[PDB]
Design a protein around this nucleic acid. Sequence first.
DNA 1: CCGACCACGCATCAGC
DNA 2: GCTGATGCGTG
DNA 3: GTCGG
Length: 331
Amino acid sequence: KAPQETLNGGITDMLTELANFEKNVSQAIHKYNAYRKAASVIAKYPHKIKSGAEAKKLPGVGTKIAEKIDEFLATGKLRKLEKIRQDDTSSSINFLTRVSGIGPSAARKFVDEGIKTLEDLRKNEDKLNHHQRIGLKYFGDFEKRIPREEMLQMQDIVLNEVKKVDSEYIATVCGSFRRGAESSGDMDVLLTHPSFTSESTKQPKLLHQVVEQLQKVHFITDTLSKGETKFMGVCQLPSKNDEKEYPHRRIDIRLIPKDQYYCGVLYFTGSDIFNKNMRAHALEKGFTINEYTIRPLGVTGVAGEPLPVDSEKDIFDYIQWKYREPKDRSE
DNA sequence: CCGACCACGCATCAGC
DNA sequence: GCTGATGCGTG
DNA sequence: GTCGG
Ligand code: NA
Ligand code: NA
C-alpha cells in the first residue's frame, strides 16, 4: 500500500535531489543509495511528517537527514540545495549525465575541458564513444516513458521475430511491463534456448542470430553494446502510414542457460523489495537465492549444490511459498 | 570506530 | 596482443 | 548516510 503526493513529496524530492547530486557530482554511490532508501521509505509512510525526529523513527532516516527535514519543514527549502542548484559546475555536471553512456567521470571530465552543454556535445562528438554518441542522439527519446500499449505492440515483433529464427528459442519480456505497468522505462527482453545451458557449450549464434532478426526487419536501429550473453541496443516501431514516428526506445535482450533461466527470470522480474523479502523467506526454509540458482542451505551454516529449477513455481515450491503472480511481486 | 552497502556484462582504458 | 580495472547502466 | 559488527 502507497499514497504519498501532497503528503511527503516535498521531502522526498529534496532528497532525490540530494541523491543525484551525490552520485553525479560527488561520486558517492553509497551515499547516493542511502538518500534513495530514505526518500523511498518516507514515500511510503502514511502520514505527514511533522518533525525530523519523526522521520528518524524510520529505517534509513538518521540524524543528518533528519536535520535536513527540519530545515525544510521550517524554512521550506534547504540552503545547501540552493547553492548547489545555483552552482554552475554541479549543474552542468548534473545535466550531462542525463545523457546515456555519460557518467560522472566523463561528465566531470567534459565539464573541465569547458564542455558542458548539449551543443558542446554536438560540436565535439569526436570526444565521445559510440554509446555516448547514440544517446547524444536519442537524448529526448531516452527520458520518455513507454506506454505498455506501444509496449504491447513492441511485444509482438520481438516475439514474432524470434519465432522465425528458432521455434525452440525462449523469449519472455520482463522487468516492469511484466509487472502489469501502464508505462515502462525500456523494454527488457529475456531469452534463452534449448541448446543453451550452464555447463553446455555457449552458442553465440543464439543471441547473435536474434538481434539480427530484429535488425533485418528494422526493429533495432542503433546498438550500445553486444556480447555472447546480452545485447544492449535501441529499437523502433514500424511507423504507421501518416502516423508520426514513435520515439526510439532502449531495449536489452538477455540470453540465458536453460538450467538457470527461471531464477534469472525470477530474479529479473523483481521487484526490488520483492527480492529482498523472498530471499529472506527462502532462507527460513533453509535456502539461499541469487540470479542463477537456489541451494540447500547447509547443515553446518553454509552448503552448496544448487537445485534443479524448471519453473518459477518450482522455485516458489522449495521455500514453501504460494506461486506468486508477477503482478503482485510488490514485495 | 569502522566496514557494508547487489552482481554483473560489456566497452574502453592503463599497463605490460 | 593480452590482461586487469574502472565506467557505465540494468533489473 | 545509515546501520550494524
Ligand atoms: Na532511523
Ligand atoms: Na548517464
